[PDB]
Amino acid sequence: AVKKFKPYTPSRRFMTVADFSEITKTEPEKSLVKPLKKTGGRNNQGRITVRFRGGGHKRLYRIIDFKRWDKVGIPAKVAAIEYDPNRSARIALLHYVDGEKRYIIAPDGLQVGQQVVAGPDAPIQVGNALPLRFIPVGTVVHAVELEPKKGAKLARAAGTSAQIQGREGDYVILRLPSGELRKVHGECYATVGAVGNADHKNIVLGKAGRSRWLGRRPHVRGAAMNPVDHPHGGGEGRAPRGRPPASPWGWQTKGLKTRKRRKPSSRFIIAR
Amino acid sequence: MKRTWQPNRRKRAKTHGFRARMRTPGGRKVLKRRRQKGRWRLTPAVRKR
RNA sequence: GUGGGAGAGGGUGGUGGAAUUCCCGGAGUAGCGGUGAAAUGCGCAGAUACCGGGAGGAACGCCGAUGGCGAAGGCAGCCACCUGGUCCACCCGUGACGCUGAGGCGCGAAAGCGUGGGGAGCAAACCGGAUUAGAUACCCGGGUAGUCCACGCCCUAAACG
RNA sequence: CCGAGGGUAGGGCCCGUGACUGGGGCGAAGUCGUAACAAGGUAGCUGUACCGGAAGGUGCGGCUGGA
RNA sequence: GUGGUUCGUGGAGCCAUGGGGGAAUCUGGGCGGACCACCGCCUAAGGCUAAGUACUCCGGGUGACCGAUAGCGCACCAGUA
RNA sequence: CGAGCUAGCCCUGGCCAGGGUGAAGCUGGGGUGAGACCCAGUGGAGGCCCGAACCGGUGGGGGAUGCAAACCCCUCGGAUG
RNA sequence: CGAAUGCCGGCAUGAGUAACGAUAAAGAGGGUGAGAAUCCCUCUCGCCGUAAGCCCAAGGGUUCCUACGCAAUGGUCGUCAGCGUAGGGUUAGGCGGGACCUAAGGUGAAGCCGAAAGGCGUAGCCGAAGGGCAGCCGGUUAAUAUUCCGGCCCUUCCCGCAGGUGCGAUGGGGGGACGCUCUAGGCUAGGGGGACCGGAGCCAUGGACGAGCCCGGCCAGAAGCGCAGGGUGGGAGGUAGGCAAAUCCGCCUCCCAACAAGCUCUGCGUGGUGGGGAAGCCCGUACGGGUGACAACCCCCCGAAGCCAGGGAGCCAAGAAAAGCCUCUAAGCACAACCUGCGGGAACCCGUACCGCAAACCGACACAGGUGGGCGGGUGCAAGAGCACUCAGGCGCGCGGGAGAACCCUCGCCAAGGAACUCUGCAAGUUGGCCCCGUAACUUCGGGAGAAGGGGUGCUCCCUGGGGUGAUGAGCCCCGGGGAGCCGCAGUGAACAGGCUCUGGCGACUGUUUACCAAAAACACAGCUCUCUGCGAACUCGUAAGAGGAGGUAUAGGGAGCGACGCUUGCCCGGUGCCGGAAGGUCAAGGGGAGGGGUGCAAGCCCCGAACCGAAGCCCCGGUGAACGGCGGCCGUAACUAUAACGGUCCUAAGGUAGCGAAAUUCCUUGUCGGGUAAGUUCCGACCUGCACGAAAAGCGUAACGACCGGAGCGCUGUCUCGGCGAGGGACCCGGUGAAAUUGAACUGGCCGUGAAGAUGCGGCCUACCCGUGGCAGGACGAAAAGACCCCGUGGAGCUUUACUGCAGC
RNA sequence: UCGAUGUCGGCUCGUCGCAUCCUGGGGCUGAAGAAGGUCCCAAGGGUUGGGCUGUUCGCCCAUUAAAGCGGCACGCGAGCU
RNA sequence: CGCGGGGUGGAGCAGCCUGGUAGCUCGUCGGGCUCAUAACCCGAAGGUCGUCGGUUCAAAUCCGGCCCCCGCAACCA
Ligand SMILES: NC[C@@H]1O[C@H](O[C@H]2[C@@H](O)[C@H](O[C@@H]3[C@@H](O)[C@H](N)C[C@H](N)[C@H]3O[C@H]3O[C@H](CO)[C@@H](O)[C@H](O)[C@H]3N)O[C@@H]2CO)[C@H](N)[C@@H](O)[C@@H]1O
Ligand SMILES: [Mg+2]
Ligand SMILES: [Mg+2]
Ligand SMILES: [Mg+2]
Ligand SMILES: [Mg+2]
Ligand SMILES: [Mg+2]
Ligand SMILES: [Mg+2]
Ligand SMILES: [Mg+2]
Ligand SMILES: [Mg+2]
Ligand SMILES: [Mg+2]
Ligand SMILES: [Mg+2]
Ligand SMILES: [Mg+2]
Ligand SMILES: [Mg+2]
Ligand SMILES: [Mg+2]
Ligand SMILES: [Mg+2]
Ligand SMILES: [Mg+2]
Ligand SMILES: [Mg+2]
Ligand SMILES: [Mg+2]
Ligand SMILES: [Mg+2]
Ligand SMILES: [Mg+2]
Ligand SMILES: [Mg+2]
Ligand SMILES: [Mg+2]
Ligand SMILES: [Mg+2]
Ligand SMILES: [Mg+2]
Ligand SMILES: [Mg+2]
Ligand SMILES: [Mg+2]
Ligand SMILES: [Mg+2]
Ligand SMILES: [Mg+2]
Ligand SMILES: [Mg+2]
Ligand SMILES: [Mg+2]
Ligand SMILES: [Mg+2]
Ligand SMILES: [Mg+2]
Ligand SMILES: [Mg+2]
Ligand SMILES: [Mg+2]
Ligand SMILES: [Mg+2]
Ligand SMILES: [Mg+2]
Ligand SMILES: [Mg+2]
Ligand SMILES: [Mg+2]
Ligand SMILES: [Mg+2]
Ligand SMILES: [Mg+2]
Ligand SMILES: [Mg+2]
Ligand SMILES: [Mg+2]
Ligand SMILES: [Mg+2]
Ligand SMILES: [Mg+2]
Ligand SMILES: [Mg+2]
Ligand SMILES: [Mg+2]
Ligand SMILES: [Mg+2]
Ligand SMILES: [Mg+2]
Ligand SMILES: [Mg+2]
Ligand SMILES: [Mg+2]
Ligand SMILES: [Mg+2]
Ligand SMILES: [Mg+2]
Ligand SMILES: [Mg+2]
Ligand SMILES: [Mg+2]
Ligand SMILES: [Mg+2]
Ligand SMILES: [Mg+2]
Ligand SMILES: [Mg+2]
Ligand SMILES: [Mg+2]
Ligand SMILES: [Mg+2]
Ligand SMILES: [Mg+2]
Ligand SMILES: [Mg+2]
Ligand SMILES: [Mg+2]
Ligand SMILES: [Mg+2]
Ligand SMILES: [Mg+2]
Ligand SMILES: [Mg+2]
Ligand SMILES: [Mg+2]
Ligand SMILES: [Mg+2]
Ligand SMILES: [Mg+2]
Ligand SMILES: [Mg+2]
Ligand SMILES: [Mg+2]
Ligand SMILES: [Mg+2]
Ligand SMILES: [Mg+2]
Ligand SMILES: [Mg+2]
Ligand SMILES: [Mg+2]
Ligand SMILES: [Mg+2]
Ligand SMILES: [Mg+2]
Ligand SMILES: [Mg+2]
Ligand SMILES: [Mg+2]
Ligand SMILES: [Mg+2]
Ligand SMILES: [Mg+2]
Ligand SMILES: [Mg+2]
Ligand SMILES: [Mg+2]
Ligand SMILES: [Mg+2]
Ligand SMILES: [Mg+2]
Ligand SMILES: [Mg+2]
Ligand SMILES: [Mg+2]
Ligand SMILES: [Mg+2]
Ligand SMILES: [Mg+2]
Ligand SMILES: [Mg+2]
Ligand SMILES: [Mg+2]
Ligand SMILES: [Mg+2]
Ligand SMILES: [Mg+2]
Ligand SMILES: [Mg+2]
Ligand SMILES: [Mg+2]
Ligand SMILES: [Mg+2]
Ligand SMILES: [Mg+2]
Ligand SMILES: [Mg+2]
Ligand SMILES: [Mg+2]
Ligand SMILES: [Mg+2]
Ligand SMILES: [Mg+2]
Ligand SMILES: [Mg+2]
Ligand SMILES: [Mg+2]
Ligand SMILES: [Mg+2]
Ligand SMILES: [Mg+2]
Ligand SMILES: [Mg+2]
Ligand SMILES: [Mg+2]
Ligand SMILES: [Mg+2]
Ligand SMILES: [Mg+2]
Ligand SMILES: [Mg+2]
Ligand SMILES: [Mg+2]
Ligand SMILES: [Mg+2]
Ligand SMILES: [Mg+2]
Ligand SMILES: [Mg+2]
Ligand SMILES: [Mg+2]
Ligand SMILES: [Mg+2]
Ligand SMILES: [Mg+2]
Ligand SMILES: [Mg+2]
Ligand SMILES: [Mg+2]
Ligand SMILES: [Mg+2]
Ligand SMILES: [Mg+2]
Ligand SMILES: [Mg+2]
Ligand SMILES: [Mg+2]
Ligand SMILES: [Mg+2]
Ligand SMILES: [Mg+2]
Ligand SMILES: [Mg+2]
Ligand SMILES: [Mg+2]
Ligand SMILES: [Mg+2]
Ligand SMILES: [Mg+2]
Ligand SMILES: [Mg+2]
Ligand SMILES: [Mg+2]
Ligand SMILES: [Mg+2]
Ligand SMILES: [Mg+2]
Ligand SMILES: [Mg+2]
Ligand SMILES: [Mg+2]
Ligand SMILES: [Mg+2]
């Protein structure tokens, strides 16, 4: 839906906030299962190695369930859907009859009170997790494992999915959010449905501060700098570059393919 | 204005203390040099309890 | 009211094959395309033509009409749901409740605009090749918006009987 | 107190004027090309859209005021 | 592929050797500056080994060495203020 | 040897008088087939406004072997981010 | 030794010169003393008072208190001192820190890595104004006290007795436990008032013996209560989860509760007892002591940002950990143990003085600078921590005295004129708070807006209306309205408190930057686009391990550019880059040996070595511009001339479209018209011959925004005509302390010559008794800095690339 | 003169040369008068206010008896800007 | 002033560097087609190569000096 504001201030006239109506009466989270201390820090042991990180709201990590094959066969009741500061998506709090409480990343269409479960069994319904094999060709799916028993790694961003395209002996072909065509092992779990919160892309930050709230420090142009700092630094009053556009570290930034050629992963990929 | 000396006992101790110098080869040599020199004070005297 | 009927009438969801285009495999050799005739162009880096496989998008051949439905714009494969109009028989209830309609309000092809999606063919703009005195055209080979969908706008027509 | 009117200040309509600029009317024998009327030598008209010295062309849908 | 040696790729051995290949046990092996013949010299891939030599914190002797702006930075409670 | 100045990030605490304007949203009324929407009233949003502390350093003057190796007077910006 | 702007030292000159560190301010009397403007005391005066006053923390470390001292330290003086000598002074189970816990970070057995030295590194450990934790109020010291003493009150521990219970962990679970903004109720702190209660005294100078003036009317406190509030559901079955176990927690399932009823927990009120208790006056202290007092110790009001606190409500950016604590069991033990009540005994270590917005910390100084947290009284201005004055409290800023010139700083005022000043209204003025009328273009519909422009503002009396708190009334308190009337030049009567418009440029906007000359139109920014990346991601740091990315997964992450928003971003792929091309050309090592040489008597051993096989890169074929970049010359032509829609030709990879255009871009230039002016190299509108705009180094627009830059007008003034007076601080004169750069020596005149070409110093002439003091600044090519430009030096550095040459990387 | 001679314009203060802009004295004039033209003596004193530009200069505005030229380190920054 | 690029029939361009021959396009002229014109067709003429000079057997061509044309530069002060 997206919340919109009137221009009672500049920067309030474009600004735009998510709709939280799917956030069920459960705004503060769940101890026990999560949260952990989350360790803010824009850099490695010592030095900054990703520029322009820092500031922005304190967070608690929700330790979510990315391998659903523990509770094969054990169903769970979806108890709530809550805000997760550390991902684009929303998260489902679910209660297993087992007693155990996990969070699943919350798919589009998930309703509270719903039944959900994981395993070879598993009715093909939104929320359920299955090894890729038993899932019908053509159904859209998410939180897909890359290699079996290694955890969900594909399609967890808000409003993303992959679609099952066909099969090939032990592998089923996937079409990933990027549009790539991937052979992913049959035995990999993946949960049916799309991610949801799909209006995430429609949000307009609206002002500088908002950027900072999310811990995004000001990014400065190479043009703004000096020859010591950047290939684009200097010279006089503005300058068009004077070389093929580059990163600060000298590599070209328009076109230069960067995936290494001899990756053994290659023989499992069929697209862009 | 604000000058450059902003005394802090803890800082002076953690920074220039006998135990800091002892911790690394760089520092151990400092004690060696100061000893051979005949320095009355190997490290700065940080006070208080 | 009671009981019936025809229909491409509207919306949402689902789905079938034919064909074009692209990728992959086989087999295959020196031209294919195109026109008034040509050339740009495609092709020994293996094209065209044929076989098999996959991908995707749009439009539904036959039925089809000089036909049907809608108040218009319009509406065509197939299935279900939701839903408007309407005709017929019976003469069953109401009992003049009737007709039109300034404003208002909704509807409103195509093209166009917004944000997002999609993009197979086609195709303004654009680029080439011919024709011309020139040709910012007709023809030719390319090709972007767009044509497609969700939602929001736009509100015009030889919206013509 | 009211009060003709004078003063300051700001708005409303109207008229005149303005370098310059837009398209328009009319002005016997100036240039350019041929769009339309015969199938007008690409049927024409049309709403919209882009492009073009110019009529104009083209895309999409529509009309018969054409086959 | 390199270092070492007077040796800087040179005709470049010898001695060390990171990488690949990879033997023999005296009729065995290495060397004598590419190489080959001959004639000779040693016996690799285990280790230990005084003395003659270097130094001068420390003690002593001596100076065609200084003598308080010299001589150590310091003759003096100096690596002090 | 230095981040006890300074530049950023991390962890933990603290500070921001007093006024202004009055978004959404509720609530009632109006409207309609249901709407949209329009009214009040309430409500208390905002790198919003005025203005201290506080963070600045705009303009001028003074100071220039200074009170000061950046200072003082008048003036100005921000002040819930 | 004579010069090295030489080194070290001593002593000169400037010079009794400038200065003596905030313009908050002083005077007098008395003491002491060898000696007083400066030390004590008293009176009078002035200054702070959201401090210039008290309380912390940091830092300092003897600076505290006392006796005796004045050579030095003090910008003078000093009998004084933060100075010199000596002596005394800091008392804790309850405050802070440690024998408690964890954060980032550090450290680090296991493990991994590294020529070495070392680098990572989960468990654990360390790490604090964060979590946990039991003291309130008064008294005494010259100097310490939540530390001593008094009263009232707790906390662990250990051994007992008494009663209860399955007790039991570094293990399970629960809790601790968490944002911002706005907030309700009940209180406390603090504050105002009182005819009431308590008090020494007081009638002054015309009046007042009066609900007269003045001072004061509290503090702490266990239990039990009382009020306000915070917390919490209780049963029973089933139980496969919480990494062993569980009666716990979680998940089902039924009944009871839906309430704070009941349980506990806080805060506040009351509380046995305990304590304080003014002005005044008299004392001798430097200071504190008695007296008032047997003090009184009472009602009303305002009232927090503080308490109840884990309160509530809304929002999006989504808001530490661990222990203490409760509980669940496990081994083990159940003569143990643990809980509860009572008794006795045990309770260590360090800090504790004083300064603490400053003369004791940071700035070489007793420095006008810097320095975190708490309290910060009253009255008035709408409010407030603002401003004026003033409590408490603390100062008069460690040279004075006179004078009353220039000149300077700071201030005040001015006739007539009001921008003529000037590079600019630079500066200074005007304006200024509140309430009430009243407001344009434009616009994104918010705004523009405090647009503009206006009026009201005091005090007196009358009538009158809501609340608050009290009972529905009294008062005390907060807001209103109506009506008469008084006074002054003037009513936010002092202080705090916009000058207003119009039109261009640039940038959207709040924001950010050259600490110490630039705050901008530069940076950033939301947003747009391109491009990389499928996850052991790309990218970055490190040789590595490893870490970031990210405990993220294409709606995500990196790099570039552009920079809200609207309308838009044309054409060129020839060159360069980037991408895509199982062909071909070229291509190193290695594979390959046709073939030739060296030895040898030969077997052999040793070299050269052509075919062909050999990758990526290049070459070549394609594509690609929100990738690097680029986007023409000439000649003619219309029935007035002028001009050229039209044509010819050369060349290109293609020859600038739209939209702007003498511009932040225009040389010729003050282009040319037009407007503003009496007058306009600037400004505003246009034409276009664009030296040399132009479409994401974006193009043309844009409301709002700005200590940005330009032009204009109104309002107002010492900016100016054009000055003048007046104030304070200096300047000057006297007493005191008393520097500086500079300095070849000096007995240091003008003109005209001359001289290395600008003479006090040489020539001739001219003038000129010796020495000072306040002033001006022409000269000594004055001082200051081995010129910052320039050039030289085969001098140095930062920077770029299709300079060379390497190297990391791929 | 580079071990430094501050460099444009303005401002304040001046002062000098005259090849004189004004005023005084003249000769010739194609000098009727008035007003000019032009030349010769002569510097004693004078030699305005604004608009635009950093401007010097210049161009305008309104006046004037006139709106003089040039030197003094394009005089003058230990005097200002 | 310095720098280097051009002057070729009526117009716009070749030609030179490797001297010996001036060619393409358009336009002009005659002929055709048409009712006529333009388009088209068939034929045809037109250049002292800016101007002085030598270099040579011979200069558009190579070299100097002027003549106009075009484009560059003119910097630290
Ligand atoms: N009245 C005509 C209107 O204007 C236009 O027409 C205008 C022009 O097109 C037209 O120009 C014509 C030209 O077309 C034609 N081929 C040649 C002619 N000599 C011109 O003529 C013009 O100029 C001449 C002399 O000055 C006059 O005498 C005459 O009246 C005038 N029409 O002159 C007209 C104005 O007078 C539109 N084409 C027409 O549709 C419109 O309705
Ligand atoms: Mg936790
Ligand atoms: Mg470290
Ligand atoms: Mg940027
Ligand atoms: Mg820069
Ligand atoms: Mg570089
Ligand atoms: Mg670079
Ligand atoms: Mg530039
Ligand atoms: Mg550059
Ligand atoms: Mg009937
Ligand atoms: Mg009836
Ligand atoms: Mg009708
Ligand atoms: Mg359409
Ligand atoms: Mg978008
Ligand atoms: Mg096509
Ligand atoms: Mg034709
Ligand atoms: Mg086509
Ligand atoms: Mg429509
Ligand atoms: Mg029809
Ligand atoms: Mg008009
Ligand atoms: Mg006209
Ligand atoms: Mg036509
Ligand atoms: Mg025609
Ligand atoms: Mg036609
Ligand atoms: Mg059309
Ligand atoms: Mg076209
Ligand atoms: Mg060597
Ligand atoms: Mg050998
Ligand atoms: Mg030998
Ligand atoms: Mg030997
Ligand atoms: Mg030995
Ligand atoms: Mg000595
Ligand atoms: Mg001696
Ligand atoms: Mg509302
Ligand atoms: Mg508010
Ligand atoms: Mg604000
Ligand atoms: Mg500044
Ligand atoms: Mg403010
Ligand atoms: Mg000498
Ligand atoms: Mg000397
Ligand atoms: Mg000396
Ligand atoms: Mg003197
Ligand atoms: Mg003097
Ligand atoms: Mg003096
Ligand atoms: Mg003083
Ligand atoms: Mg004495
Ligand atoms: Mg005062
Ligand atoms: Mg002492
Ligand atoms: Mg003392
Ligand atoms: Mg004494
Ligand atoms: Mg003294
Ligand atoms: Mg002093
Ligand atoms: Mg003392
Ligand atoms: Mg102990
Ligand atoms: Mg500890
Ligand atoms: Mg610990
Ligand atoms: Mg840790
Ligand atoms: Mg370590
Ligand atoms: Mg603590
Ligand atoms: Mg404690
Ligand atoms: Mg004390
Ligand atoms: Mg138990
Ligand atoms: Mg526990
Ligand atoms: Mg626990
Ligand atoms: Mg009396
Ligand atoms: Mg009490
Ligand atoms: Mg268990
Ligand atoms: Mg007393
Ligand atoms: Mg709360
Ligand atoms: Mg622990
Ligand atoms: Mg103490
Ligand atoms: Mg104390
Ligand atoms: Mg303080
Ligand atoms: Mg002092
Ligand atoms: Mg001080
Ligand atoms: Mg401060
Ligand atoms: Mg006020
Ligand atoms: Mg207060
Ligand atoms: Mg104040
Ligand atoms: Mg005046
Ligand atoms: Mg006046
Ligand atoms: Mg005036
Ligand atoms: Mg002026
Ligand atoms: Mg002037
Ligand atoms: Mg101005
Ligand atoms: Mg001003
Ligand atoms: Mg302006
Ligand atoms: Mg502006
Ligand atoms: Mg800005
Ligand atoms: Mg700053
Ligand atoms: Mg600066
Ligand atoms: Mg600013
Ligand atoms: Mg690192
Ligand atoms: Mg990693
Ligand atoms: Mg991580
Ligand atoms: Mg990105
Ligand atoms: Mg930019
Ligand atoms: Mg920019
Ligand atoms: Mg821009
Ligand atoms: Mg472009
Ligand atoms: Mg190109
Ligand atoms: Mg290319
Ligand atoms: Mg290409
Ligand atoms: Mg390539
Ligand atoms: Mg190759
Ligand atoms: Mg122009
Ligand atoms: Mg330009
Ligand atoms: Mg003016
Ligand atoms: Mg003008
Ligand atoms: Mg003009
Ligand atoms: Mg530009
Ligand atoms: Mg560009
Ligand atoms: Mg700003
Ligand atoms: Mg004055
Ligand atoms: Mg005075
Ligand atoms: Mg004196
Ligand atoms: Mg003399
Ligand atoms: Mg001379
Ligand atoms: Mg002499
Ligand atoms: Mg002389
Ligand atoms: Mg002088
Ligand atoms: Mg001088
Ligand atoms: Mg000098
Ligand atoms: Mg020099
Ligand atoms: Mg050289
Ligand atoms: Mg010089
Ligand atoms: Mg000198
Ligand atoms: Mg004369
Ligand atoms: Mg005369
Ligand atoms: Mg003069
Ligand atoms: Mg000049
Ligand atoms: Mg000169
Ligand atoms: Mg001068
Ligand atoms: Mg100066
Ligand atoms: Mg220079």
Residues 6+ apart with CB under 8 A from A140: A161, A162, A163, A164, A192, A193, A194
Q: What is the dihedral of CA A247, A253, A256, A258, to 10 degrees?
A: 60
**How far apart are the C-alpha atoms of A31 and A52, rounded to whole Å?**
32
Residues 6+ apart with CB under 8 A from A80: A24, A25, A26, A92, A93, A112
Q: Strand E: which positions are within 7 A of a protein CB?
A: 73, 78-81
Backbone angles phi, psi at A80, to 5 degrees: -170, 165
Dihedral over Cα of A227, A228, A231, A232: its sign: negative
Q: How many CB atoms lie within 10 A of CB A179?
A: 8
Q: Which of A131, A140, A219 is nearest to A176 (CA)?
A: A140
DSSP chain A: --EE---SSTTSSS-EE---TTS-S--S--SSS--EE----SBSSSSBSSSSB--S---EE------GGGGBS--EEEEEEE--TTSSS-EEEEEETTS-EEEEE--TT--TT-EE-BSSS--S-TT-EEEGGGSPTT-EEESEESSTTS-EEES-STT--EEEEEEETTEEEEE-TTS-EEEEETT-EEEES----GGGGG----SHHHHHHTTBPPP--GGGS-TTT-TT---SS----SSS-B-TTS-B-SS---S-TT-GGGGGB---
Backbone angles phi, psi at A249, to 5 degrees: -100, 15
Q: Which residues pair with A169 in a beta bridge?
A: none
The structure tokens listed for A7 are 């221009």
Q: How many CB atoms lie within 10 A of CB A4?
A: 12
The structure tokens listed for A117 are 């479960």
Resolution given for this structure, in angstroms? 3.7
Token pair 């824009």 is found at A42
Give the Å distances, CA to CA, from A14 to A7, A9, A158, A204, A213. 8, 10, 22, 7, 17
Length of chain B: 49
**How far apart are the C-alpha atoms of B20 and B43, rounded to whole Å?**
10
How many Cα neighbours within 13 Å face the side chain of A272? 1
**How far apart are the C-alpha atoms of A162 and A156, rounded to whole Å?**
10
The structure tokens listed for A32 are 């026990």
For B11, the 3-state DSSP assignment is helix
Q: Solved by what technique?
A: X-ray
Token pair 């009466």 is found at A25
Q: Check residues 161 to 190 of chain A and report those whose beta carbon is under 7 Å from nucleic acid strand C.
A: 163, 165-166, 175, 179
The answer to whether strand C lies under 7 Å from the CB of residue A4 is no
Q: Which of A166, A167, A155 is nearest to A193 (CA)?
A: A155
Strand order in the sheet with A115-116: A101-105, A91-96, A76-82, A115-116
For B47, the 3-state DSSP assignment is coil
Q: Strand F: which positions are within 7 A of a protein CB?
A: 1-6, 8-12, 23-24, 45-48, 70-71, 81
**How far apart are the C-alpha atoms of A148 and A11, rounded to whole Å?**
47
Instruction: Name the nucleotide nearest A215; use CA and C1'.
Output: G317
